[PDB]
Amino acid sequence: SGMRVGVLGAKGKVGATMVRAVAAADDLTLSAELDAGDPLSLLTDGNTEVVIDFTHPDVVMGNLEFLIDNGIHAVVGTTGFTAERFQQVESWLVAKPNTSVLIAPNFAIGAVLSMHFAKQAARFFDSAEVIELHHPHKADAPSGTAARTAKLIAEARKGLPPNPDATSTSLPGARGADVDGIPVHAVRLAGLVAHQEVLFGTEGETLTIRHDSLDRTSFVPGVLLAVRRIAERPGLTVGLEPLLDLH
Amino acid sequence: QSGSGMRVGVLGAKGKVGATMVRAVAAADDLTLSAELDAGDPLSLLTDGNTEVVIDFTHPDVVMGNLEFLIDNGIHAVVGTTGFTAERFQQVESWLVAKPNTSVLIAPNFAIGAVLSMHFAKQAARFFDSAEVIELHHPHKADAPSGTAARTAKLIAEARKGLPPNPDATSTSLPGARGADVDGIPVHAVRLAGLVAHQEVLFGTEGETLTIRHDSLDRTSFVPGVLLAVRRIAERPGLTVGLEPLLDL
Amino acid sequence: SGMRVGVLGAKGKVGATMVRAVAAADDLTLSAELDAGDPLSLLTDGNTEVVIDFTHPDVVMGNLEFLIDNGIHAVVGTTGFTAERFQQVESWLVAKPNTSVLIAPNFAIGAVLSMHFAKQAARFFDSAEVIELHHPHKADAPSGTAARTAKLIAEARKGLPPNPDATSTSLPGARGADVDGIPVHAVRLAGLVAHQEVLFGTEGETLTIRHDSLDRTSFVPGVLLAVRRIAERPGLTVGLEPLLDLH
Amino acid sequence: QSGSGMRVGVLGAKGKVGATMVRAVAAADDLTLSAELDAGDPLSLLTDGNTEVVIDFTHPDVVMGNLEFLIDNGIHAVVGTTGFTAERFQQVESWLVAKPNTSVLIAPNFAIGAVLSMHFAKQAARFFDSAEVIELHHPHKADAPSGTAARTAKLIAEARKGLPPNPDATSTSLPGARGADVDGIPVHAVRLAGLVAHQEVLFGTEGETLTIRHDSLDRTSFVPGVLLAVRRIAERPGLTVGLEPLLDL
Ligand SMILES: [Cl-]
Ligand SMILES: [Cl-]
Ligand SMILES: [Cl-]
Ligand SMILES: [Cl-]
Ligand SMILES: [Cl-]
Ligand SMILES: [Cl-]
Ligand code: NA
Ligand code: NA
Ligand code: NA
Ligand code: NA
């Protein structure tokens, strides 16, 4: 009765988490747990219906070719998807029109909603800024998520005057990093995990959208949601947002 | 040859909202103030001066009379006045059948930020195990919780129908600690000197939380939404309820 | 060279955490790890200098009598200290004037500072309220910490007019719980751990003091601070605050 | 027989701060406005009307002249004017030796909330691995970061001397992402329409964080601290620097 779910990259950090979550879920049956060395025929041997793939950019295309050829739906968190790679995936899917592939940069439902909300709000305010706050072991400033969020905001603000700012005197860096005309401030503080606030303002009011992750495994519910719903959309879907079915 | 602006009248012009809108219409380059009426002024002044659209924040006792005149004369109406029952909305709809070109918009909130917040709360509500509302206002406010907080909590509850209720292990408590229960959604009302009008909607599931916060630092923060409604009101014939459709979300 | 630290109640949840932290600290040597059944003579047999005690209210007095008699300093997190118990501890200490005992309800440095700050600010504003937010497995609303904080605030506001409030119409519970004239609001939300905000306001400005704990073991640095500094104050100290040496 | 109030003069009375203080002194029941002077008015008006204390928010170019007169005449001074070098503070001190009963208070910030925040930041700073400042202001502000944020970061750095610096694994970044470095303390400056003046100081160690936030929603939020200084200024003979001693913390 339960949906048969395989996990590729099962010994990686994300994969191993997803293995546990699939096992715990009552309505999902773990049908495979593969890492480098394991033949993909194990997926078809055990009647896997959908896989979760967080492998490495160097192997994901090989995985996807097999999956699609065998009508096995794929929930993909692996990065490194160039325009040429997306195009290849699309062509493979022409031959297998009932197969579904989802490729998403972010699976945390809260982060996905937060980005969508920021996109909807952006054109209705004079000012927009992003503040992100993370643990002080993080290599990159600003985060991937903050940079992608600021780009969405910029894109949605097409044609608007830039953010008003009378700054004439400053210490270097005080106004943050400029991502497509949107300031992005990166706080690195012991005691934090992963946090992001998007601020919008016009004379008289402000609107703030804040996402807090308190545990590194907070994406799990979005991956499982993608697994349960992935077959609703035939073909290739990019990003988790369409799956949320926002009216 | 450049067209003069849209001719805008304001009803209830000596009220606090009206007077603000009078100033904002005068300041706007694309809008011409064609009337500023309060109780005692005949509505024929609107047609005498070729008013195209009115802003109406009057009183529930007069608004239906205003709307009947406006619709009969093909004058669009942006209405912030409350007290709209199902019977009243129906009456407005039937008046409009005879005047298909005319547009009426009735909205309980014109602050763009508050409208977006409620919309966001509605979209997020089904995706999290827990939802709560915290609202914070100046300490001269008569009602706890606010109208906006109560409406927000109701939208949230509605969108969560067929989900399990909020998890809560509370077995021992001081009375009131868990807030007011609005359709299974806790609502907490802070009253603090130095505040104006503030609302936070909180959503959570194990591992993450999402917070939507709206701050109004000035009582006149609705102005940009009323003006938006005025500029765009004619795009939709007939009756529109709420500002949200006009945002084109 | 390193200070010899024993832990009583070592198989309890707090004790076991403190055992690990003592072992990890370079300047502290774990000299005993006792639970029910173990004779206290093990403390003196192994030259223990200071103990951490998070046992049970039913045993703590017996522990303290022995510790004091043997000149062993005590950092005590166990509750259930009545006025009669504090008095007994004080009398035992008369005979042993160089021994130190610290009894504290809260060891998280951030929570201790937050309570002290709230106390200092309280008399300078027209309004004060407490919002606490916790995971939804918590039995008590409001928390112990929030209730103690609101009491400190009330006490510091002696003689002031009560909080201004024009509320004439309300749903039951909307204005929170009244702790000595101070509203306390208790949020219970999945995804949270332990969080507290104290809000102060007068016309024109507000001041907010917020403490966030993201992990249940965030008290550890305060217990260790108490252990390192406990001998600076002879006799009985109640609360961690005096140890922080706030000028 | 009930004593009339304390006789308070305001210098720079037509300036924005002065005019506000004139109104606040007039409104206060225990204080009598005895003078309201601006440039052009002779200081002898203060002694002619038996002024006991003045509030001075004038300009750095005149304040020393004002203070010399005030101290010579035994008139207490509550001073918000900036530009006080070590040489100026020393000059004030020496004037006061001759007039031991007189009190002068010079303070860079009179908002009680801002004074407490800085004090709290100073007390907390040595107890956490990380410290950062975020300040948020209206987008007409010329300077980034604000004066108050820069001063706060300096206090924090000073209180953290002999601690390891803030931990940070940043190896790759866009320019400016990590804020401005003020004495090893990151300071981030947000400029957003709809804001007034806001500051958050953040402290953290693995497992917990502590945040101190000050919000000013109105430009006149300093008034209660100036009045406090006026009422209490005579309790301390001589020169006091900063409002913090008067709070009795
Ligand atoms: Cl990371
Ligand atoms: Cl990221
Ligand atoms: Cl309301
Ligand atoms: Cl608990
Ligand atoms: Cl507690
Ligand atoms: Cl400043
Ligand atoms: Na399962
Ligand atoms: Na105009
Ligand atoms: Na050790
Ligand atoms: Na007066």
mmCIF file of N, CA and C in Angstrom, chain A residues 93-183:
data_model
loop_
_atom_site.group_PDB
_atom_site.id
_atom_site.type_symbol
_atom_site.label_atom_id
_atom_site.label_comp_id
_atom_site.label_asym_id
_atom_site.label_seq_id
_atom_site.Cartn_x
_atom_site.Cartn_y
_atom_site.Cartn_z
ATOM 1 N N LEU A 93 12.620 13.612 -20.857
ATOM 2 C CA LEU A 93 11.219 13.517 -20.432
ATOM 3 C C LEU A 93 10.157 13.492 -21.553
ATOM 4 N N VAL A 94 10.502 14.012 -22.732
ATOM 5 C CA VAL A 94 9.620 13.915 -23.918
ATOM 6 C C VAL A 94 9.219 12.450 -24.192
ATOM 7 N N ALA A 95 10.203 11.551 -24.163
ATOM 8 C CA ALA A 95 9.965 10.100 -24.355
ATOM 9 C C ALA A 95 9.143 9.444 -23.231
ATOM 10 N N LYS A 96 9.109 10.048 -22.047
ATOM 11 C CA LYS A 96 8.439 9.455 -20.881
ATOM 12 C C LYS A 96 7.452 10.416 -20.205
ATOM 13 N N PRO A 97 6.399 10.830 -20.937
ATOM 14 C CA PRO A 97 5.516 11.923 -20.556
ATOM 15 C C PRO A 97 4.753 11.760 -19.251
ATOM 16 N N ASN A 98 4.664 10.564 -18.686
ATOM 17 C CA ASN A 98 4.065 10.441 -17.352
ATOM 18 C C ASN A 98 5.044 10.481 -16.175
ATOM 19 N N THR A 99 6.329 10.630 -16.461
ATOM 20 C CA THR A 99 7.324 10.721 -15.404
ATOM 21 C C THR A 99 7.516 12.165 -14.933
ATOM 22 N N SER A 100 7.773 12.324 -13.650
ATOM 23 C CA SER A 100 7.956 13.621 -13.044
ATOM 24 C C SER A 100 9.334 13.752 -12.413
ATOM 25 N N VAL A 101 9.940 14.908 -12.642
ATOM 26 C CA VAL A 101 11.203 15.253 -12.031
ATOM 27 C C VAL A 101 11.097 16.638 -11.385
ATOM 28 N N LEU A 102 11.444 16.750 -10.108
ATOM 29 C CA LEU A 102 11.456 18.057 -9.443
ATOM 30 C C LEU A 102 12.875 18.402 -9.011
ATOM 31 N N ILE A 103 13.359 19.577 -9.397
ATOM 32 C CA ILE A 103 14.696 20.020 -9.020
ATOM 33 C C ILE A 103 14.528 21.327 -8.243
ATOM 34 N N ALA A 104 15.001 21.375 -6.993
ATOM 35 C CA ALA A 104 14.739 22.531 -6.150
ATOM 36 C C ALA A 104 15.961 22.869 -5.356
ATOM 37 N N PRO A 105 16.270 24.161 -5.260
ATOM 38 C CA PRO A 105 17.369 24.666 -4.465
ATOM 39 C C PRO A 105 17.053 24.687 -2.930
ATOM 40 N N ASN A 106 15.765 24.731 -2.555
ATOM 41 C CA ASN A 106 15.359 24.856 -1.154
ATOM 42 C C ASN A 106 14.144 24.039 -0.890
ATOM 43 N N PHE A 107 14.211 23.169 0.093
ATOM 44 C CA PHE A 107 13.061 22.340 0.449
ATOM 45 C C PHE A 107 12.381 22.727 1.768
ATOM 46 N N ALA A 108 12.978 23.626 2.537
ATOM 47 C CA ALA A 108 12.328 24.048 3.801
ATOM 48 C C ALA A 108 11.057 24.842 3.445
ATOM 49 N N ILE A 109 9.887 24.355 3.854
ATOM 50 C CA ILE A 109 8.617 24.959 3.456
ATOM 51 C C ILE A 109 8.558 26.450 3.858
ATOM 52 N N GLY A 110 9.033 26.739 5.061
ATOM 53 C CA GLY A 110 9.097 28.098 5.600
ATOM 54 C C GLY A 110 9.973 29.001 4.761
ATOM 55 N N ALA A 111 11.081 28.475 4.245
ATOM 56 C CA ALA A 111 11.975 29.328 3.422
ATOM 57 C C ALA A 111 11.349 29.528 2.067
ATOM 58 N N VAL A 112 10.639 28.515 1.582
ATOM 59 C CA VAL A 112 9.996 28.608 0.260
ATOM 60 C C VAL A 112 8.861 29.601 0.312
ATOM 61 N N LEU A 113 8.037 29.504 1.333
ATOM 62 C CA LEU A 113 6.947 30.506 1.488
ATOM 63 C C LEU A 113 7.464 31.923 1.654
ATOM 64 N N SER A 114 8.519 32.064 2.450
ATOM 65 C CA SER A 114 9.133 33.343 2.703
ATOM 66 C C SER A 114 9.611 33.991 1.413
ATOM 67 N N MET A 115 10.239 33.227 0.535
ATOM 68 C CA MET A 115 10.688 33.765 -0.781
ATOM 69 C C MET A 115 9.534 34.180 -1.685
ATOM 70 N N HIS A 116 8.499 33.350 -1.726
ATOM 71 C CA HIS A 116 7.273 33.676 -2.465
ATOM 72 C C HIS A 116 6.594 34.953 -1.930
ATOM 73 N N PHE A 117 6.504 35.069 -0.599
ATOM 74 C CA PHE A 117 5.907 36.263 0.009
ATOM 75 C C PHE A 117 6.709 37.526 -0.322
ATOM 76 N N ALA A 118 8.019 37.421 -0.227
ATOM 77 C CA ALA A 118 8.896 38.537 -0.569
ATOM 78 C C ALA A 118 8.678 38.995 -2.001
ATOM 79 N N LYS A 119 8.524 38.036 -2.900
ATOM 80 C CA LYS A 119 8.283 38.308 -4.313
ATOM 81 C C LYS A 119 6.961 39.041 -4.508
ATOM 82 N N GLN A 120 5.911 38.602 -3.822
ATOM 83 C CA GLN A 120 4.599 39.240 -3.951
ATOM 84 C C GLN A 120 4.591 40.683 -3.383
ATOM 85 N N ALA A 121 5.264 40.892 -2.254
ATOM 86 C CA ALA A 121 5.276 42.202 -1.581
ATOM 87 C C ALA A 121 6.149 43.261 -2.248
ATOM 88 N N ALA A 122 7.146 42.843 -3.007
ATOM 89 C CA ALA A 122 8.292 43.722 -3.332
ATOM 90 C C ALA A 122 7.929 44.985 -4.095
ATOM 91 N N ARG A 123 6.994 44.867 -5.020
ATOM 92 C CA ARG A 123 6.647 46.038 -5.835
ATOM 93 C C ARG A 123 5.778 47.074 -5.124
ATOM 94 N N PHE A 124 5.297 46.786 -3.917
ATOM 95 C CA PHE A 124 4.346 47.686 -3.267
ATOM 96 C C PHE A 124 4.942 48.593 -2.211
ATOM 97 N N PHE A 125 6.269 48.665 -2.108
ATOM 98 C CA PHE A 125 6.944 49.455 -1.066
ATOM 99 C C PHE A 125 8.108 50.211 -1.636
ATOM 100 N N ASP A 126 8.421 51.339 -1.023
ATOM 101 C CA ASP A 126 9.525 52.178 -1.504
ATOM 102 C C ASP A 126 10.897 51.523 -1.244
ATOM 103 N N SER A 127 11.030 50.838 -0.100
ATOM 104 C CA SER A 127 12.316 50.260 0.338
ATOM 105 C C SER A 127 12.243 48.751 0.600
ATOM 106 N N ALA A 128 13.338 48.062 0.288
ATOM 107 C CA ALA A 128 13.482 46.630 0.574
ATOM 108 C C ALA A 128 14.916 46.317 0.931
ATOM 109 N N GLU A 129 15.099 45.547 2.001
ATOM 110 C CA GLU A 129 16.423 45.085 2.472
ATOM 111 C C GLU A 129 16.309 43.670 3.048
ATOM 112 N N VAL A 130 17.420 42.941 3.005
ATOM 113 C CA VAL A 130 17.483 41.590 3.536
ATOM 114 C C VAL A 130 18.533 41.532 4.655
ATOM 115 N N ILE A 131 18.143 40.949 5.791
ATOM 116 C CA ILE A 131 19.080 40.650 6.882
ATOM 117 C C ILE A 131 19.064 39.165 7.075
ATOM 118 N N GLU A 132 20.244 38.555 7.009
ATOM 119 C CA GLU A 132 20.361 37.132 7.288
ATOM 120 C C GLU A 132 21.335 36.966 8.444
ATOM 121 N N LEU A 133 21.077 35.942 9.256
ATOM 122 C CA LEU A 133 21.868 35.699 10.452
ATOM 123 C C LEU A 133 22.125 34.206 10.543
ATOM 124 N N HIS A 134 23.383 33.859 10.709
ATOM 125 C CA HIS A 134 23.832 32.462 10.750
ATOM 126 C C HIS A 134 24.901 32.238 11.800
ATOM 127 N N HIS A 135 25.066 30.968 12.177
ATOM 128 C CA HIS A 135 26.210 30.529 13.004
ATOM 129 C C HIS A 135 27.535 31.024 12.423
ATOM 130 N N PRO A 136 28.567 31.177 13.268
ATOM 131 C CA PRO A 136 29.832 31.762 12.780
ATOM 132 C C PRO A 136 30.849 30.758 12.181
ATOM 133 N N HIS A 137 30.396 29.534 11.907
ATOM 134 C CA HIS A 137 31.124 28.522 11.071
ATOM 135 C C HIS A 137 30.790 28.547 9.569
ATOM 136 N N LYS A 138 29.963 29.486 9.144
ATOM 137 C CA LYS A 138 29.542 29.554 7.754
ATOM 138 C C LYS A 138 30.552 30.297 6.863
ATOM 139 N N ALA A 139 30.930 29.647 5.767
ATOM 140 C CA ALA A 139 32.016 30.125 4.882
ATOM 141 C C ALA A 139 31.606 31.324 4.022
ATOM 142 N N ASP A 140 30.333 31.346 3.614
ATOM 143 C CA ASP A 140 29.838 32.325 2.633
ATOM 144 C C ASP A 140 28.933 33.430 3.222
ATOM 145 N N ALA A 141 29.237 34.671 2.839
ATOM 146 C CA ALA A 141 28.468 35.852 3.202
ATOM 147 C C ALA A 141 28.148 36.750 1.980
ATOM 148 N N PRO A 142 26.886 36.971 1.636
ATOM 149 C CA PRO A 142 25.741 36.411 2.310
ATOM 150 C C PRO A 142 25.455 34.969 1.865
ATOM 151 N N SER A 143 24.561 34.298 2.583
ATOM 152 C CA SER A 143 24.114 32.938 2.221
ATOM 153 C C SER A 143 23.534 32.870 0.807
ATOM 154 N N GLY A 144 23.535 31.660 0.261
ATOM 155 C CA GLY A 144 22.859 31.336 -1.006
ATOM 156 C C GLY A 144 21.400 31.782 -0.987
ATOM 157 N N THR A 145 20.675 31.420 0.074
ATOM 158 C CA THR A 145 19.237 31.748 0.198
ATOM 159 C C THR A 145 18.986 33.258 0.201
ATOM 160 N N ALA A 146 19.840 34.003 0.892
ATOM 161 C CA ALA A 146 19.688 35.464 0.955
ATOM 162 C C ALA A 146 19.940 36.111 -0.381
ATOM 163 N N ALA A 147 20.956 35.623 -1.073
ATOM 164 C CA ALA A 147 21.310 36.143 -2.395
ATOM 165 C C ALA A 147 20.205 35.886 -3.414
ATOM 166 N N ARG A 148 19.663 34.662 -3.411
ATOM 167 C CA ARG A 148 18.518 34.266 -4.301
ATOM 168 C C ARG A 148 17.276 35.103 -3.964
ATOM 169 N N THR A 149 17.008 35.284 -2.666
ATOM 170 C CA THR A 149 15.892 36.135 -2.217
ATOM 171 C C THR A 149 16.053 37.595 -2.716
ATOM 172 N N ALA A 150 17.224 38.172 -2.521
ATOM 173 C CA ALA A 150 17.452 39.567 -2.970
ATOM 174 C C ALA A 150 17.281 39.710 -4.496
ATOM 175 N N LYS A 151 17.667 38.673 -5.245
ATOM 176 C CA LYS A 151 17.516 38.676 -6.717
ATOM 177 C C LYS A 151 16.060 38.623 -7.139
ATOM 178 N N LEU A 152 15.288 37.752 -6.500
ATOM 179 C CA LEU A 152 13.840 37.740 -6.720
ATOM 180 C C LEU A 152 13.217 39.095 -6.445
ATOM 181 N N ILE A 153 13.577 39.690 -5.324
ATOM 182 C CA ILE A 153 13.055 41.019 -4.925
ATOM 183 C C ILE A 153 13.396 42.059 -6.022
ATOM 184 N N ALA A 154 14.656 42.085 -6.434
ATOM 185 C CA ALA A 154 15.112 43.053 -7.451
ATOM 186 C C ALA A 154 14.298 42.920 -8.743
ATOM 187 N N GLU A 155 14.234 41.684 -9.210
ATOM 188 C CA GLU A 155 13.474 41.304 -10.402
ATOM 189 C C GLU A 155 12.016 41.766 -10.312
ATOM 190 N N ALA A 156 11.362 41.509 -9.183
ATOM 191 C CA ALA A 156 9.978 41.971 -8.984
ATOM 192 C C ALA A 156 9.833 43.512 -8.899
ATOM 193 N N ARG A 157 10.922 44.211 -8.612
ATOM 194 C CA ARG A 157 10.918 45.683 -8.499
ATOM 195 C C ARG A 157 11.310 46.412 -9.782
ATOM 196 N N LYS A 158 11.256 45.686 -10.897
ATOM 197 C CA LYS A 158 11.605 46.221 -12.207
ATOM 198 C C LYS A 158 10.820 47.467 -12.492
ATOM 199 N N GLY A 159 11.519 48.498 -12.937
ATOM 200 C CA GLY A 159 10.881 49.758 -13.240
ATOM 201 C C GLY A 159 10.667 50.698 -12.084
ATOM 202 N N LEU A 160 10.788 50.214 -10.852
ATOM 203 C CA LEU A 160 10.619 51.093 -9.701
ATOM 204 C C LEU A 160 11.866 51.935 -9.491
ATOM 205 N N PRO A 161 11.709 53.153 -8.913
ATOM 206 C CA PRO A 161 12.907 53.867 -8.451
ATOM 207 C C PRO A 161 13.751 52.999 -7.472
ATOM 208 N N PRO A 162 15.086 53.176 -7.445
ATOM 209 C CA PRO A 162 15.878 52.393 -6.507
ATOM 210 C C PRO A 162 15.510 52.741 -5.051
ATOM 211 N N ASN A 163 15.979 51.940 -4.096
ATOM 212 C CA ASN A 163 15.733 52.219 -2.657
ATOM 213 C C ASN A 163 16.179 53.657 -2.332
ATOM 214 N N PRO A 164 15.333 54.463 -1.659
ATOM 215 C CA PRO A 164 15.807 55.805 -1.266
ATOM 216 C C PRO A 164 16.896 55.681 -0.197
ATOM 217 N N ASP A 165 17.904 56.521 -0.305
ATOM 218 C CA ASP A 165 19.023 56.531 0.643
ATOM 219 C C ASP A 165 19.806 57.844 0.577
ATOM 220 N N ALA A 166 19.775 58.626 1.657
ATOM 221 C CA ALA A 166 20.558 59.891 1.740
ATOM 222 C C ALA A 166 21.996 59.707 2.247
ATOM 223 N N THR A 167 22.437 58.466 2.457
ATOM 224 C CA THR A 167 23.803 58.214 2.961
ATOM 225 C C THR A 167 24.815 59.017 2.111
ATOM 226 N N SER A 168 25.498 59.946 2.774
ATOM 227 C CA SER A 168 26.614 60.724 2.194
ATOM 228 C C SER A 168 27.967 60.419 2.856
ATOM 229 N N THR A 169 27.944 59.961 4.107
ATOM 230 C CA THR A 169 29.165 59.611 4.848
ATOM 231 C C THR A 169 28.982 58.235 5.517
ATOM 232 N N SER A 170 29.983 57.373 5.369
ATOM 233 C CA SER A 170 29.924 56.027 5.925
ATOM 234 C C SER A 170 31.260 55.338 6.090
ATOM 235 N N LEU A 171 31.299 54.427 7.050
ATOM 236 C CA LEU A 171 32.388 53.465 7.147
ATOM 237 C C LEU A 171 32.139 52.414 6.075
ATOM 238 N N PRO A 172 33.211 51.872 5.475
ATOM 239 C CA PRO A 172 33.037 50.822 4.468
ATOM 240 C C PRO A 172 32.295 49.589 5.013
ATOM 241 N N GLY A 173 31.336 49.102 4.230
ATOM 242 C CA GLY A 173 30.509 47.932 4.581
ATOM 243 C C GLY A 173 29.240 48.154 5.391
ATOM 244 N N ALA A 174 29.053 49.361 5.927
ATOM 245 C CA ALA A 174 27.924 49.635 6.839
ATOM 246 C C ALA A 174 26.559 49.380 6.196
ATOM 247 N N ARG A 175 26.449 49.682 4.901
ATOM 248 C CA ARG A 175 25.189 49.532 4.161
ATOM 249 C C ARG A 175 25.017 48.149 3.514
ATOM 250 N N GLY A 176 25.861 47.188 3.882
ATOM 251 C CA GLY A 176 25.664 45.814 3.446
ATOM 252 C C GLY A 176 26.180 45.584 2.043
ATOM 253 N N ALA A 177 25.896 44.395 1.522
ATOM 254 C CA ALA A 177 26.255 44.037 0.131
ATOM 255 C C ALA A 177 25.094 44.380 -0.780
ATOM 256 N N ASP A 178 25.421 44.889 -1.959
ATOM 257 C CA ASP A 178 24.435 45.307 -2.941
ATOM 258 C C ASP A 178 24.197 44.127 -3.884
ATOM 259 N N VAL A 179 23.032 43.497 -3.774
ATOM 260 C CA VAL A 179 22.639 42.406 -4.679
ATOM 261 C C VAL A 179 21.501 42.946 -5.539
ATOM 262 N N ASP A 180 21.845 43.341 -6.769
ATOM 263 C CA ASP A 180 20.902 43.896 -7.776
ATOM 264 C C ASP A 180 20.108 45.128 -7.263
ATOM 265 N N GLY A 181 20.784 46.013 -6.533
ATOM 266 C CA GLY A 181 20.133 47.177 -5.886
ATOM 267 C C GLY A 181 19.475 46.932 -4.518
ATOM 268 N N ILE A 182 19.570 45.706 -4.004
ATOM 269 C CA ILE A 182 18.982 45.326 -2.692
ATOM 270 C C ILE A 182 20.090 45.076 -1.662
ATOM 271 N N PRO A 183 20.124 45.886 -0.583
ATOM 272 C CA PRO A 183 21.102 45.614 0.492
ATOM 273 C C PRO A 183 20.883 44.274 1.212
#
